[PDB]
Design a protein around this ligand. Structure first.
Ligand SMILES: [Zn+2]
Length: 323
């Protein structure tokens, strides 16, 4: 029995030099992302709604136009909810489907259901339209480098449906898409034809982006088994800063701070985490002040912060994949 599922434990990044770091910083466009990937998502899109369908089409369209050989799959399922049985659709975008290992980036694309109030509509800009757009921008910015993937390791993007509770958060009313996908992936042999390893053994690391877009986020180092990757984010943020490649940024106000978090934050990584998948949870603590209010909109997004995080994440991925 091959020990390939243990490779993630020893995987090391291929660190980019200064010139490559400048190249990545210049290759991403916050204004392009804003207009082409983010604004079309700033709409009401709770599960089963017309907005959900439109968001899903937008995400797929933006990935399909890229040169890299992305394979798109829509994982549609039924679940009981406080409003009865409903349909949900997770979006999975994968390079090299039969590749044994994948670094996974994820976020949820649904928005919490709220009835309109005083003509205001909830669109969850940081929760999680921005993370969705950051993943789309990453696919676009690194497209040429990702095309060269067409170490049996590649990249996968997951956009979960139904992260939000239809009412208030509870064990049975929340995490619909991830509870479903995690169970499905855990019972799917991988690579095809495998005897005893699942798609979950193939997940090197799950990088879950959530609640990003507000000013001054501080991401804690939640888990000891991914702490060495959290440190890479810190190193990348530090070098991009020292090279003058970040905007309105200081080390005192750095995003990746040295600090554990006792508790546990319920989010889409939970069903994966509890089945042994290593997770790097990029959710800030505390949550954005506009969390779950009509003010979680475009107007309250911090543009240079998102731009800085796009550069950091893009360098993290290139270094992880050795690209
Ligand atoms: Zn939320």
């Amino acid at each position: 029995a091959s020990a390939w599922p243990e490779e993630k434990n020893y995987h090391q990044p291929a660190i980019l030099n200064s010139s490559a770091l400048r190249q990545i910083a210049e290759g991403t466009s916050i204004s392009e992302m804003w207009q082409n990937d983010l604004q079309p998502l700033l709409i009401e899109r709770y599960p089963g709604s017309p907005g959900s369908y439109a968001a899903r089409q937008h995400i797929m369209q933006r990935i399909q136009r890229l040169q890299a050989d992305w394979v798109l799959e829509i994982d549609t399922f039924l679940s009981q909810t406080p409003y009865g049985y409903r349909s949900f659709s997770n979006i999975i975008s994968t390079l090299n489907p039969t590749a044994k290992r994948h670094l996974v980036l994820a976020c949820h694309y649904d928005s919490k259901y709220f009835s309109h109030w005083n003509n205001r509509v909830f669109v969850g800009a940081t929760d999680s339209a921005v993370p969705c757009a950051m993943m789309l921008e990453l696919a676009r910015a690194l497209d040429k480098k990702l095309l060269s993937l067409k170490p049996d390791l590649s990249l996968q993007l997951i956009f979960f449906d139904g992260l939000e509770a239809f009412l208030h958060w509870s064990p049975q009313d929340s995490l619909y898409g991830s509870r479903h996908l995690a169970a499905k992936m855990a019972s799917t042999p991988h690579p095809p034809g495998a005897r005893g390893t699942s798609q979950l053994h193939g997940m090197d690391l799950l990088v879950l982006l959530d609640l990003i877009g507000a000013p001054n986020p501080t991401f804690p180092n939640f888990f000891p088994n991914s702490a060495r990757w959290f440190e890479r984010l810190q190193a990348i943020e530090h070098e991009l800063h020292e090279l003058g490649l970040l905007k309105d940024h200081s080390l005192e106000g750095r995003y990746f701070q040295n600090y554990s978090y006792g508790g546990v934050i319920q989010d889409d990584h939970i069903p994966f985490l509890r089945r042994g998948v290593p997770v790097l949870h990029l959710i800030p603590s505390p949550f954005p002040e506009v969390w779950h209010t009509m003010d979680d909109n475009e107007e309250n997004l911090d543009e240079s912060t998102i731009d800085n995080l796009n550069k950091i994440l893009q360098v993290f991925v290139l270094e992880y994949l050795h690209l």
